């Protein structure tokens, strides 16, 4: 029922030791963001961006399940993360 997500770092952003995750379809981009920040032992003041298709940054209230159904491929959704903006 859950969906597979793969997280990839952009630029010099820290790399997650564990990249492939199974998440509830109802989890939002913000929920995903909060998880990574405390996983990388980052801080709230530090902003973190998430990207789909290496193209656009979905609103943080968007659900991963919808993004998967629309932009997923080969059984997973690829999301890129970065401490700074990458694609406008």
């Amino acid at each position: 029922k859950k969906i597979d997500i793969l997280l990839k770092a952009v630029g010099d952003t820290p790399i997650m030791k564990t990249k492939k995750w199974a998440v509830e379809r109802t989890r939002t981009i913000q929920g995903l963001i909060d998880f990574i920040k405390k996983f990388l032992k980052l801080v709230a003041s530090e902003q973190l961006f998430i990207y789909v298709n290496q193209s656009f940054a979905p609103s943080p209230d968007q659900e991963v399940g919808t993004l998967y159904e629309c932009f997923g491929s080969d059984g997973k959704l690829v999301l890129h993360y970065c401490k700074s903006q990458a694609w406008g």
Partner: peptide, 13 residues
């Protein structure tokens, strides 16, 4: 093989 995020969050950061 994907790690369960719900498991980790409820296990111990």
């Amino acid at each position: 093989e994907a790690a369960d995020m719900e498991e980790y969050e409820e296990s111990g950061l």
